[PDB]
Design a protein around this ligand. Sequence first.
Ligand SMILES: NC[C@@H]1O[C@H](O[C@H]2[C@@H](O)[C@H](O[C@@H]3[C@@H](O)[C@H](N)C[C@H](N)[C@H]3O[C@H]3O[C@H](CO)[C@@H](O)[C@H](O)[C@H]3N)O[C@@H]2CO)[C@H](N)[C@@H](O)[C@@H]1O
Ligand SMILES: [Mg+2]
Ligand SMILES: [Mg+2]
Ligand SMILES: [Mg+2]
Ligand SMILES: [Mg+2]
Ligand SMILES: [Mg+2]
Ligand SMILES: [Mg+2]
Ligand SMILES: [Mg+2]
Ligand SMILES: [Mg+2]
Ligand SMILES: [Mg+2]
Ligand SMILES: [Mg+2]
Ligand SMILES: [Mg+2]
Ligand SMILES: [Mg+2]
Ligand SMILES: [Mg+2]
Ligand SMILES: [Mg+2]
Ligand SMILES: [Mg+2]
Ligand SMILES: [Mg+2]
Ligand SMILES: [Mg+2]
Ligand SMILES: [Mg+2]
Ligand SMILES: [Mg+2]
Ligand SMILES: [Mg+2]
Ligand SMILES: [Mg+2]
Ligand SMILES: [Mg+2]
Ligand SMILES: [Mg+2]
Ligand SMILES: [Mg+2]
Ligand SMILES: [Mg+2]
Ligand SMILES: [Mg+2]
Ligand SMILES: [Mg+2]
Ligand SMILES: [Mg+2]
Ligand SMILES: [Mg+2]
Ligand SMILES: [Mg+2]
Ligand SMILES: [Mg+2]
Ligand SMILES: [Mg+2]
Ligand SMILES: [Mg+2]
Ligand SMILES: [Mg+2]
Ligand SMILES: [Mg+2]
Ligand SMILES: [Mg+2]
Ligand SMILES: [Mg+2]
Ligand SMILES: [Mg+2]
Ligand SMILES: [Mg+2]
Ligand SMILES: [Mg+2]
Ligand SMILES: [Mg+2]
Ligand SMILES: [Mg+2]
Ligand SMILES: [Mg+2]
Ligand SMILES: [Mg+2]
Ligand SMILES: [Mg+2]
Ligand SMILES: [Mg+2]
Ligand SMILES: [Mg+2]
Ligand SMILES: [Mg+2]
Ligand SMILES: [Mg+2]
Ligand SMILES: [Mg+2]
Ligand SMILES: [Mg+2]
Ligand SMILES: [Mg+2]
Ligand SMILES: [Mg+2]
Ligand SMILES: [Mg+2]
Ligand SMILES: [Mg+2]
Ligand SMILES: [Mg+2]
Ligand SMILES: [Mg+2]
Ligand SMILES: [Mg+2]
Ligand SMILES: [Mg+2]
Ligand SMILES: [Mg+2]
Ligand SMILES: [Mg+2]
Ligand SMILES: [Mg+2]
Ligand SMILES: [Mg+2]
Ligand SMILES: [Mg+2]
Ligand SMILES: [Mg+2]
Ligand SMILES: [Mg+2]
Ligand SMILES: [Mg+2]
Ligand SMILES: [Mg+2]
Ligand SMILES: [Mg+2]
Ligand SMILES: [Mg+2]
Ligand SMILES: [Mg+2]
Ligand SMILES: [Mg+2]
Ligand SMILES: [Mg+2]
Ligand SMILES: [Mg+2]
Ligand SMILES: [Mg+2]
Ligand SMILES: [Mg+2]
Ligand SMILES: [Mg+2]
Ligand SMILES: [Mg+2]
Ligand SMILES: [Mg+2]
Ligand SMILES: [Mg+2]
Ligand SMILES: [Mg+2]
Ligand SMILES: [Mg+2]
Ligand SMILES: [Mg+2]
Ligand SMILES: [Mg+2]
Ligand SMILES: [Mg+2]
Ligand SMILES: [Mg+2]
Ligand SMILES: [Mg+2]
Ligand SMILES: [Mg+2]
Ligand SMILES: [Mg+2]
Ligand SMILES: [Mg+2]
Ligand SMILES: [Mg+2]
Ligand SMILES: [Mg+2]
Ligand SMILES: [Mg+2]
Ligand SMILES: [Mg+2]
Ligand SMILES: [Mg+2]
Ligand SMILES: [Mg+2]
Ligand SMILES: [Mg+2]
Ligand SMILES: [Mg+2]
Ligand SMILES: [Mg+2]
Ligand SMILES: [Mg+2]
Ligand SMILES: [Mg+2]
Ligand SMILES: [Mg+2]
Ligand SMILES: [Mg+2]
Ligand SMILES: [Mg+2]
Ligand SMILES: [Mg+2]
Ligand SMILES: [Mg+2]
Ligand SMILES: [Mg+2]
Ligand SMILES: [Mg+2]
Ligand SMILES: [Mg+2]
Ligand SMILES: [Mg+2]
Ligand SMILES: [Mg+2]
Ligand SMILES: [Mg+2]
Ligand SMILES: [Mg+2]
Ligand SMILES: [Mg+2]
Ligand SMILES: [Mg+2]
Ligand SMILES: [Mg+2]
Ligand SMILES: [Mg+2]
Ligand SMILES: [Mg+2]
Ligand SMILES: [Mg+2]
Ligand SMILES: [Mg+2]
Ligand SMILES: [Mg+2]
Ligand SMILES: [Mg+2]
Ligand SMILES: [Mg+2]
Ligand SMILES: [Mg+2]
Ligand SMILES: [Mg+2]
Ligand SMILES: [Mg+2]
Ligand SMILES: [Mg+2]
Ligand SMILES: [Mg+2]
Ligand SMILES: [Mg+2]
Ligand SMILES: [Mg+2]
Ligand SMILES: [Mg+2]
Ligand SMILES: [Mg+2]
Ligand SMILES: [Mg+2]
Ligand SMILES: [Mg+2]
Ligand SMILES: [Mg+2]
Ligand SMILES: [Mg+2]
Ligand SMILES: [Mg+2]
Ligand SMILES: [Mg+2]
Ligand SMILES: [Mg+2]
Ligand SMILES: [Mg+2]
Ligand SMILES: [Mg+2]
Ligand SMILES: [Mg+2]
Ligand SMILES: [Mg+2]
Ligand SMILES: [Mg+2]
Ligand SMILES: [Mg+2]
Ligand SMILES: [Mg+2]
Ligand SMILES: [Mg+2]
Ligand SMILES: [Mg+2]
Ligand SMILES: [Mg+2]
Ligand SMILES: [Mg+2]
Ligand SMILES: [Mg+2]
Ligand SMILES: [Mg+2]
Ligand SMILES: [Mg+2]
Ligand SMILES: [Mg+2]
Ligand SMILES: [Mg+2]
Ligand SMILES: [Mg+2]
Ligand SMILES: [Mg+2]
Ligand SMILES: [Mg+2]
Ligand SMILES: [Mg+2]
Ligand SMILES: [Mg+2]
Ligand SMILES: [Mg+2]
Ligand SMILES: [Mg+2]
Ligand SMILES: [Mg+2]
Ligand SMILES: [Mg+2]
Ligand SMILES: [Mg+2]
Ligand SMILES: [Mg+2]
Ligand SMILES: [Mg+2]
Ligand SMILES: [Mg+2]
Ligand SMILES: [Mg+2]
Ligand SMILES: [Mg+2]
Ligand SMILES: [Mg+2]
Lengths: 49, 272
Amino acid sequence: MKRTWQPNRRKRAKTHGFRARMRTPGGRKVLKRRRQKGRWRLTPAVRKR
Amino acid sequence: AVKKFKPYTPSRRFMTVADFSEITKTEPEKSLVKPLKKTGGRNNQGRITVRFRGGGHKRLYRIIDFKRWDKVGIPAKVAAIEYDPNRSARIALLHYVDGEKRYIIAPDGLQVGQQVVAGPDAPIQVGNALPLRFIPVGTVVHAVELEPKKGAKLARAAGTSAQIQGREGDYVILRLPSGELRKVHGECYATVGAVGNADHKNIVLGKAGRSRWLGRRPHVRGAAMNPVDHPHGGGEGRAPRGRPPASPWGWQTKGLKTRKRRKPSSRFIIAR
RNA sequence: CGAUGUCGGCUCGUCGCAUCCUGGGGCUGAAGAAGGUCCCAAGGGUUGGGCUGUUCGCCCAUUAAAGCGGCACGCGAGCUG
RNA sequence: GAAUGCCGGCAUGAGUAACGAUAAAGAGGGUGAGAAUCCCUCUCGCCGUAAGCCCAAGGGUUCCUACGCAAUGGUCGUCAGCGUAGGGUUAGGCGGGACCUAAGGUGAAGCCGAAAGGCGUAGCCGAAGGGCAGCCGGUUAAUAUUCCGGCCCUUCCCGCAGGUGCGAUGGGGGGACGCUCUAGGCUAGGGGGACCGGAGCCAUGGACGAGCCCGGCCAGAAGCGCAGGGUGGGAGGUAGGCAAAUCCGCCUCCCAACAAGCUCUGCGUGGUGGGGAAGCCCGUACGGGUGACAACCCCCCGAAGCCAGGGAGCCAAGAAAAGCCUCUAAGCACAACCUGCGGGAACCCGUACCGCAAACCGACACAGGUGGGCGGGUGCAAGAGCACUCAGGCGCGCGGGAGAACCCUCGCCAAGGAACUCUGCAAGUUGGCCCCGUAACUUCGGGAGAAGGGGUGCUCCCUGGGGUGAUGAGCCCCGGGGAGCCGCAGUGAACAGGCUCUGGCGACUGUUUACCAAAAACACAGCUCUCUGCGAACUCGUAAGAGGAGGUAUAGGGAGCGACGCUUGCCCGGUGCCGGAAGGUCAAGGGGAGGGGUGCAAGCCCCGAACCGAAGCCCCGGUGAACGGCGGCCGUAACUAUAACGGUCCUAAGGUAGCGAAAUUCCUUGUCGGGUAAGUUCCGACCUGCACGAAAAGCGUAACGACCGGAGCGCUGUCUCGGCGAGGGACCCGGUGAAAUUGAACUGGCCGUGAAGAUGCGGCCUACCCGUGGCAGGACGAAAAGACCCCGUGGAGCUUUACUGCAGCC
RNA sequence: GAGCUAGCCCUGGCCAGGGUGAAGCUGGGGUGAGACCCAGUGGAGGCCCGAACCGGUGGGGGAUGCAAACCCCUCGGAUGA
RNA sequence: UGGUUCGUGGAGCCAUGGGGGAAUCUGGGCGGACCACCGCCUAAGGCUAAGUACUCCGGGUGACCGAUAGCGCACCAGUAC
RNA sequence: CGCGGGGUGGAGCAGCCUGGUAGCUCGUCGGGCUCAUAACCCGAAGGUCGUCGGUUCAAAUCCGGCCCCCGCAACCA
RNA sequence: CCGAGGGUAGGGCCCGUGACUGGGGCGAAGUCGUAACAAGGUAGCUGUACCGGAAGGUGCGGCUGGA
RNA sequence: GUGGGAGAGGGUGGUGGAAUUCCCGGAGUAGCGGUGAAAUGCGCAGAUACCGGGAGGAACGCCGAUGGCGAAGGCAGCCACCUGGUCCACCCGUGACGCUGAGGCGCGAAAGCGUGGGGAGCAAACCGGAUUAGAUACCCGGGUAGUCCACGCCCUAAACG
Ligand SMILES: NC[C@@H]1O[C@H](O[C@H]2[C@@H](O)[C@H](O[C@@H]3[C@@H](O)[C@H](N)C[C@H](N)[C@H]3O[C@H]3O[C@H](CO)[C@@H](O)[C@H](O)[C@H]3N)O[C@@H]2CO)[C@H](N)[C@@H](O)[C@@H]1O
Ligand SMILES: [Mg+2]
Ligand SMILES: [Mg+2]
Ligand SMILES: [Mg+2]
Ligand SMILES: [Mg+2]
Ligand SMILES: [Mg+2]
Ligand SMILES: [Mg+2]
Ligand SMILES: [Mg+2]
Ligand SMILES: [Mg+2]
Ligand SMILES: [Mg+2]
Ligand SMILES: [Mg+2]
Ligand SMILES: [Mg+2]
Ligand SMILES: [Mg+2]
Ligand SMILES: [Mg+2]
Ligand SMILES: [Mg+2]
Ligand SMILES: [Mg+2]
Ligand SMILES: [Mg+2]
Ligand SMILES: [Mg+2]
Ligand SMILES: [Mg+2]
Ligand SMILES: [Mg+2]
Ligand SMILES: [Mg+2]
Ligand SMILES: [Mg+2]
Ligand SMILES: [Mg+2]
Ligand SMILES: [Mg+2]
Ligand SMILES: [Mg+2]
Ligand SMILES: [Mg+2]
Ligand SMILES: [Mg+2]
Ligand SMILES: [Mg+2]
Ligand SMILES: [Mg+2]
Ligand SMILES: [Mg+2]
Ligand SMILES: [Mg+2]
Ligand SMILES: [Mg+2]
Ligand SMILES: [Mg+2]
Ligand SMILES: [Mg+2]
Ligand SMILES: [Mg+2]
Ligand SMILES: [Mg+2]
Ligand SMILES: [Mg+2]
Ligand SMILES: [Mg+2]
Ligand SMILES: [Mg+2]
Ligand SMILES: [Mg+2]
Ligand SMILES: [Mg+2]
Ligand SMILES: [Mg+2]
Ligand SMILES: [Mg+2]
Ligand SMILES: [Mg+2]
Ligand SMILES: [Mg+2]
Ligand SMILES: [Mg+2]
Ligand SMILES: [Mg+2]
Ligand SMILES: [Mg+2]
Ligand SMILES: [Mg+2]
Ligand SMILES: [Mg+2]
Ligand SMILES: [Mg+2]
Ligand SMILES: [Mg+2]
Ligand SMILES: [Mg+2]
Ligand SMILES: [Mg+2]
Ligand SMILES: [Mg+2]
Ligand SMILES: [Mg+2]
Ligand SMILES: [Mg+2]
Ligand SMILES: [Mg+2]
Ligand SMILES: [Mg+2]
Ligand SMILES: [Mg+2]
Ligand SMILES: [Mg+2]
Ligand SMILES: [Mg+2]
Ligand SMILES: [Mg+2]
Ligand SMILES: [Mg+2]
Ligand SMILES: [Mg+2]
Ligand SMILES: [Mg+2]
Ligand SMILES: [Mg+2]
Ligand SMILES: [Mg+2]
Ligand SMILES: [Mg+2]
Ligand SMILES: [Mg+2]
Ligand SMILES: [Mg+2]
Ligand SMILES: [Mg+2]
Ligand SMILES: [Mg+2]
Ligand SMILES: [Mg+2]
Ligand SMILES: [Mg+2]
Ligand SMILES: [Mg+2]
Ligand SMILES: [Mg+2]
Ligand SMILES: [Mg+2]
Ligand SMILES: [Mg+2]
Ligand SMILES: [Mg+2]
Ligand SMILES: [Mg+2]
Ligand SMILES: [Mg+2]
Ligand SMILES: [Mg+2]
Ligand SMILES: [Mg+2]
Ligand SMILES: [Mg+2]
Ligand SMILES: [Mg+2]
Ligand SMILES: [Mg+2]
Ligand SMILES: [Mg+2]
Ligand SMILES: [Mg+2]
Ligand SMILES: [Mg+2]
Ligand SMILES: [Mg+2]
Ligand SMILES: [Mg+2]
Ligand SMILES: [Mg+2]
Ligand SMILES: [Mg+2]
Ligand SMILES: [Mg+2]
Ligand SMILES: [Mg+2]
Ligand SMILES: [Mg+2]
Ligand SMILES: [Mg+2]
Ligand SMILES: [Mg+2]
Ligand SMILES: [Mg+2]
Ligand SMILES: [Mg+2]
Ligand SMILES: [Mg+2]
Ligand SMILES: [Mg+2]
Ligand SMILES: [Mg+2]
Ligand SMILES: [Mg+2]
Ligand SMILES: [Mg+2]
Ligand SMILES: [Mg+2]
Ligand SMILES: [Mg+2]
Ligand SMILES: [Mg+2]
Ligand SMILES: [Mg+2]
Ligand SMILES: [Mg+2]
Ligand SMILES: [Mg+2]
Ligand SMILES: [Mg+2]
Ligand SMILES: [Mg+2]
Ligand SMILES: [Mg+2]
Ligand SMILES: [Mg+2]
Ligand SMILES: [Mg+2]
Ligand SMILES: [Mg+2]
Ligand SMILES: [Mg+2]
Ligand SMILES: [Mg+2]
Ligand SMILES: [Mg+2]
Ligand SMILES: [Mg+2]
Ligand SMILES: [Mg+2]
Ligand SMILES: [Mg+2]
Ligand SMILES: [Mg+2]
Ligand SMILES: [Mg+2]
Ligand SMILES: [Mg+2]
Ligand SMILES: [Mg+2]
Ligand SMILES: [Mg+2]
Ligand SMILES: [Mg+2]
Ligand SMILES: [Mg+2]
Ligand SMILES: [Mg+2]
Ligand SMILES: [Mg+2]
Ligand SMILES: [Mg+2]
Ligand SMILES: [Mg+2]
Ligand SMILES: [Mg+2]
Ligand SMILES: [Mg+2]
Ligand SMILES: [Mg+2]
Ligand SMILES: [Mg+2]
Ligand SMILES: [Mg+2]
Ligand SMILES: [Mg+2]
Ligand SMILES: [Mg+2]
Ligand SMILES: [Mg+2]
Ligand SMILES: [Mg+2]
Ligand SMILES: [Mg+2]
Ligand SMILES: [Mg+2]
Ligand SMILES: [Mg+2]
Ligand SMILES: [Mg+2]
Ligand SMILES: [Mg+2]
Ligand SMILES: [Mg+2]
Ligand SMILES: [Mg+2]
Ligand SMILES: [Mg+2]
Ligand SMILES: [Mg+2]
Ligand SMILES: [Mg+2]
Ligand SMILES: [Mg+2]
Ligand SMILES: [Mg+2]
Ligand SMILES: [Mg+2]
Ligand SMILES: [Mg+2]
Ligand SMILES: [Mg+2]
Ligand SMILES: [Mg+2]
Ligand SMILES: [Mg+2]
Ligand SMILES: [Mg+2]
Ligand SMILES: [Mg+2]
Ligand SMILES: [Mg+2]
Ligand SMILES: [Mg+2]
Ligand SMILES: [Mg+2]
Ligand SMILES: [Mg+2]
Ligand SMILES: [Mg+2]
Ligand SMILES: [Mg+2]
Ligand SMILES: [Mg+2]
Ligand SMILES: [Mg+2]
Ligand SMILES: [Mg+2]
């Protein structure tokens, strides 16, 4: 059947990107938490040009 | 007149379509004056706030003239009468000698080629606009302003009118389509005649689809729902309500008057 | 009750006898034929359909007879639903 | 030592299940330490509106090559999409960006919000939408509309040359738009040819033949040619197009009425460029040569594509913005702009490979899911359907044998057909086209593919229409008529309704419980009630704001009913809603009679009665397509029986019509009638309706239904009642190799006994040790710390005239 | 968190081929003028058959599956809500 | 209405959203309703070290662990997944 | 089986809960009006209060046991 | 070839019959009431319409077969 | 044909006043309605009676008749348009063109039906109050369809002289 993962580079970027997270206090805290944690990747790596 | 069909299909046996014979050879509209992009959307910034809206034909807005006092004294020739997707009525395309082209909402009896004009001057004829004062008591009228210089707001639906009843210092009394008795300021413009396309009420949609074409989504009964959804939801195999009938939001829907009492508008109203 | 699947049906049977038939027999208000009633006896047999989910039962047409009951109202790691 | 404990390890089942589609394999040779699995050749099979080719998304080294086999590969592996290394992705013209706007996002101005933040005209952002200049060939082991060859275009910038008032983010025009049906000419694509090109071929009985086989194009500026789209021309007047315009709009005289002319595309032609089969020979993993000076032509079919902003009809009435033309404003007119010509300048990113899939989404080389374009040929009425087949690509990464049960999938069956069963569940029968021929009933459309029939192949003769061609040939579609041949059978294989009668429910197409319910449920036109005067009612938000609606009573919200026909009775006492400037009560507040506390006092401080005080409730009316409700007991007619009739008690009033043992009927298989050999079902009746009933509508209703019930015909393996055959497993051999479960076990029957159902205790009987294929009675077999039940002063969702609050409104 | 799913907004795409033959139009018939009736034409429709496509009706398989919804046969809709 | 031990309590004090609304030392607040007396303070402007808190960082020590412990990580771990 | 409600002149209902008095309508009887019946008018009769018990000074009434009648309930399996 | 008829399939008309139901006619002395004939005690009749155990009532207009 | 005449003949548009009902303002009280008699009902929450203003619907007093017109059904305030029949005079024109009429077609009171509007008065049904043995009747108080307009059906009658 159709499963739940339907990859889209634009969606992933607009949805979970560094700039989206930065836009709101909710998201800014996510970066803070991930930084303090020592996460190698703050936001998902969306590729291609 | 109303177009009628033979039952060559079920739902074609009741279905019924407007007569478009008053639609003069001018079916597609007029750029310049209108159209605008019209912005379909069944809801506010976010959430739906009027249920069951959506779908249905794309539209172009015809930006019509609801304040006729710009062109006081300037007459215009009625050039055409065309279909307007965004109202029950039809619209008149008129050419002002000025050059300017406006649409007026098209009254019953309006003929193409006719002369029409607005102002204190203005022969009392079908199509003309006047401040309510100079209009003879008892004449039927439409596109009436509520307060002066604020635009036509009463009687624009197909086949509607108001009748002038009497006067009272600065106000003339109106009898509105609903039957209400209203004091409306003398200085309010209103155009003589009834609205026309009066056979609009006689049309039978005929099937579900037609409803959808006009963007009317299926309306579901409270009875059909559940207690979480509606006061009428549940219980077992059908149910008669079990309380005084209500809206989904709990207010009673048979009888409960809802106009706020202390409206300052009150001292200008005399009926139902 | 940290689970013993619960009606009926189908399939496969098997056991009790307080025996429906067939075999043996005493009494009969048993002429004979055919009955009635009890005793002995399970070796084997104990039909096909209409109705109802039905068990059961009432019919239809037969039969030597159309037996009763137990086996977790026998049998769903066999089936059905 | 136990916690269905936690982590780790190793056991058991067990060499057991499986090895991922029943499209399928065989052989010779090569390579290698090793080959069913790699390479090659021949043979065979499968796909072919794909299982073939091209885009996009996603993926990200998977592409090419060399060297490799520990692991990954469900077996093998010399192979690989795997390991190591190196190589590989070339653009002003394709896509995206130095262009435009859509929804939506952001957001100066501004409005709002405890903070965070929310709203928001302008503008900015935002694309499979608009705008927008490259086609054909050749080369690489791997890239090409990118490199190369040919031919052709676009922007800029600088010059010359000739024109003109040039000139804005501003005005106007244009861009610019729906659905269905389409005309004319073309192209793509295809079919055919005695004509042209071509290596070769006579087999196996005959054919050296107008023979078989293969192939007979592509792109292409200017200029034409042919199709077709676009568009009137002047002169006045001028108050509108938010300044100004010569532009645009409007008005008026003229000249056109036409595509005449201007244009603008499509197609054809075109300077030139380029390709070019079978077959044969080679050595490649694959390609190279020759065939070739290849020829490169004529008919015919023909789009859904092109001309395209084409036409007609219809109603539900069909984006914006820039480029583009034109108008003028500031200004500048040694400026600038338009045209022709040279010359120069032309950036950033993507470009490999996979792409219906072993490379994307499903933990996997997973039988699933994934948008767009091309998708040949014959035959079947047509077609994207079906059978075979081009090109092209595969045989699905375990095999070998065997020929048990049993299972899956498939084929046939005597006689009989529903006797099968909850149910004809399943399966059969039927099946396409053409032509005859069709009942009730009906809303006059239907029911209708009703039912039921006949024709269907091949050959010869005669004949009638078109289309392309000149009015003719041919080629191409449609037809008619007459004789004749063969078979069991002529849509000879593949695709292709079983039918009828009759109830119930719902009008109908539709919608739904993604993953057990597709329905009689939801929806639906339509009906009715009701609220709403516009800063509408109502809905979301604390707000601002927004939806309603750029709508205005023929409108919008809410409720119920649910096409249509006929209809929808009586009850307003209770509840609700509506209407009542009276009265009763009623909070803050006003008011202070009166009292109290301290003060030597002036004072300060408290209570505090009358009375004035809203909504609300009470109270008075209305209101049932508002919540709802719509009786009991006696007696009576000249056979009985029954009761039109009377009496009486009660109510706010005591269910009318219509319907009725029902999707309602307990007693119930009510009682009659019908179908049957027989009928707890069904149908028609009666009415004693436990417990119908008139918009939670009543009674009907043609048409409709993968709805539920009853019957019949047709037909059949459902059945009597089974039998045979096929293939995939099952079994044996080789390779690989799991699982839940598992206190340990050396794990028999009976009769007892035991917590009341014992392999394990007692007694007796039976019983050599170990497997394998099978059947499932048991180990209260596995699986889930029972869902039912109860318990817990456990939790949740829902309700209301439970309590208490809150929003909300008054 | 709406890359699944439900609704809506913006902008694109898709639906082979067959039937049936509504209004309208043209002619004729009729009439004072009509209504109306015949042909021919026309191509309407939550019309019909049926692929693609979107579904999921019945049955069988599958049940440590190919698959945490699949496969086979059968079936609904397919110019429209 | 909050705050204080203070939950309306005899409920002050301190802060305050609403209404009314002064005075400048013979002025004003407080000492738990209120009043008299005796006392204490001087609101409606602001700044002010030190003692006090914590431990990403460096050091020191441990009747602290010794790779299932000790930080999740003694090992390129906030990684693989 | 369980629950709660009901038996009163000839008929249908009151009277009980706050025990002492049994009343209402119809009917029946006698008389009148009428030619005659009814209607109407004037007079009158008529109740072991389902039975068994006792509580009281006294039971239709209050309490128990039966008897008929009416109505509801009988669920989760 | 046609062809008596036979078989199959579906229609049209008529006759008979059927649980039950509708009204009708008729049958000396059963029930309820008083509709009409006298101004029949509400003039009657009437087409239509609604309602009622029944005659019938009432609405609308008409009629003289009434003043 | 010419020249006239009378008429509620028909269709559409428009318009007048009387009265009823309702609302509003005034002034005003204790009863008003109604019948055979009553009661329900309306009325101190300010009725009835009276004045003033407003809205709305319907029917047209007097003229008016035993009268007029039409083929009937039927038609009645006034005005205008559109229009049918009709009678008189003059004897000018045509010249037998005439009468009737199965079917057909059109019209056709009232009630009723459909869709929409309208709804003051009246009023089937329905509800109350009396009356009666009982009244689903007659009398009284309320009251819905309907009565009114448009358009479309319906086709009856003591449609009668
Ligand atoms: N009689 C003719 C038609 O039928 C009905 O009439 C029938 C009945 O109504 C009528 O019944 C009458 C009754 O009215 C009257 N008041 C009392 C009388 N005893 C009855 O009589 C009837 O029944 C008896 C026995 O039962 C028979 O013997 C007698 O013949 C018969 N007429 O008897 C008739 C039967 O013959 C209509 N009423 C009458 O008007 C109609 O036109
Ligand atoms: Mg625009
Ligand atoms: Mg947002
Ligand atoms: Mg609904
Ligand atoms: Mg529900
Ligand atoms: Mg609720
Ligand atoms: Mg129910
Ligand atoms: Mg109820
Ligand atoms: Mg409810
Ligand atoms: Mg248990
Ligand atoms: Mg256990
Ligand atoms: Mg014995
Ligand atoms: Mg004997
Ligand atoms: Mg036996
Ligand atoms: Mg049968
Ligand atoms: Mg059965
Ligand atoms: Mg049993
Ligand atoms: Mg037995
Ligand atoms: Mg038992
Ligand atoms: Mg059992
Ligand atoms: Mg069983
Ligand atoms: Mg078992
Ligand atoms: Mg079941
Ligand atoms: Mg473990
Ligand atoms: Mg085993
Ligand atoms: Mg095995
Ligand atoms: Mg195996
Ligand atoms: Mg495989
Ligand atoms: Mg070798
Ligand atoms: Mg094939
Ligand atoms: Mg790699
Ligand atoms: Mg490779
Ligand atoms: Mg190699
Ligand atoms: Mg391997
Ligand atoms: Mg594998
Ligand atoms: Mg090797
Ligand atoms: Mg590699
Ligand atoms: Mg640049
Ligand atoms: Mg941009
Ligand atoms: Mg932009
Ligand atoms: Mg914002
Ligand atoms: Mg584009
Ligand atoms: Mg481009
Ligand atoms: Mg490549
Ligand atoms: Mg190329
Ligand atoms: Mg090039
Ligand atoms: Mg522009
Ligand atoms: Mg070509
Ligand atoms: Mg040749
Ligand atoms: Mg030979
Ligand atoms: Mg060819
Ligand atoms: Mg060419
Ligand atoms: Mg200007
Ligand atoms: Mg070549
Ligand atoms: Mg066009
Ligand atoms: Mg712009
Ligand atoms: Mg210029
Ligand atoms: Mg590339
Ligand atoms: Mg590529
Ligand atoms: Mg594809
Ligand atoms: Mg594989
Ligand atoms: Mg796959
Ligand atoms: Mg995969
Ligand atoms: Mg697909
Ligand atoms: Mg094709
Ligand atoms: Mg093909
Ligand atoms: Mg073909
Ligand atoms: Mg075909
Ligand atoms: Mg195919
Ligand atoms: Mg091969
Ligand atoms: Mg057989
Ligand atoms: Mg046979
Ligand atoms: Mg048979
Ligand atoms: Mg049977
Ligand atoms: Mg049976
Ligand atoms: Mg059946
Ligand atoms: Mg079947
Ligand atoms: Mg039929
Ligand atoms: Mg034949
Ligand atoms: Mg029925
Ligand atoms: Mg349905
Ligand atoms: Mg489901
Ligand atoms: Mg679905
Ligand atoms: Mg279905
Ligand atoms: Mg289902
Ligand atoms: Mg309806
Ligand atoms: Mg909101
Ligand atoms: Mg708004
Ligand atoms: Mg709006
Ligand atoms: Mg509405
Ligand atoms: Mg319903
Ligand atoms: Mg109706
Ligand atoms: Mg009702
Ligand atoms: Mg009530
Ligand atoms: Mg009331
Ligand atoms: Mg009430
Ligand atoms: Mg009130
Ligand atoms: Mg007070
Ligand atoms: Mg009050
Ligand atoms: Mg009734
Ligand atoms: Mg019955
Ligand atoms: Mg029978
Ligand atoms: Mg029977
Ligand atoms: Mg029945
Ligand atoms: Mg019901
Ligand atoms: Mg009832
Ligand atoms: Mg109801
Ligand atoms: Mg219904
Ligand atoms: Mg029914
Ligand atoms: Mg039906
Ligand atoms: Mg359907
Ligand atoms: Mg269905
Ligand atoms: Mg079988
Ligand atoms: Mg086999
Ligand atoms: Mg093996
Ligand atoms: Mg042993
Ligand atoms: Mg035992
Ligand atoms: Mg033992
Ligand atoms: Mg032992
Ligand atoms: Mg074994
Ligand atoms: Mg087994
Ligand atoms: Mg178990
Ligand atoms: Mg438990
Ligand atoms: Mg439960
Ligand atoms: Mg408790
Ligand atoms: Mg979505
Ligand atoms: Mg088609
Ligand atoms: Mg014609
Ligand atoms: Mg036609
Ligand atoms: Mg069509
Ligand atoms: Mg369709
Ligand atoms: Mg279809
Ligand atoms: Mg396609
Ligand atoms: Mg299925
Ligand atoms: Mg299908
Ligand atoms: Mg279809
Ligand atoms: Mg506090
Ligand atoms: Mg307290
Ligand atoms: Mg304050
Ligand atoms: Mg203070
Ligand atoms: Mg103080
Ligand atoms: Mg102090
Ligand atoms: Mg103190
Ligand atoms: Mg102090
Ligand atoms: Mg200070
Ligand atoms: Mg400080
Ligand atoms: Mg240690
Ligand atoms: Mg550790
Ligand atoms: Mg260690
Ligand atoms: Mg750890
Ligand atoms: Mg007497
Ligand atoms: Mg339960
Ligand atoms: Mg329960
Ligand atoms: Mg014959
Ligand atoms: Mg008969
Ligand atoms: Mg009489
Ligand atoms: Mg009378
Ligand atoms: Mg009478
Ligand atoms: Mg009458
Ligand atoms: Mg009446
Ligand atoms: Mg006249
Ligand atoms: Mg003469
Ligand atoms: Mg005649
Ligand atoms: Mg009539
Ligand atoms: Mg009438
Ligand atoms: Mg009616
Ligand atoms: Mg009507
Ligand atoms: Mg309607
Ligand atoms: Mg009245
Ligand atoms: Mg009356
Ligand atoms: Mg009234
Ligand atoms: Mg007649």
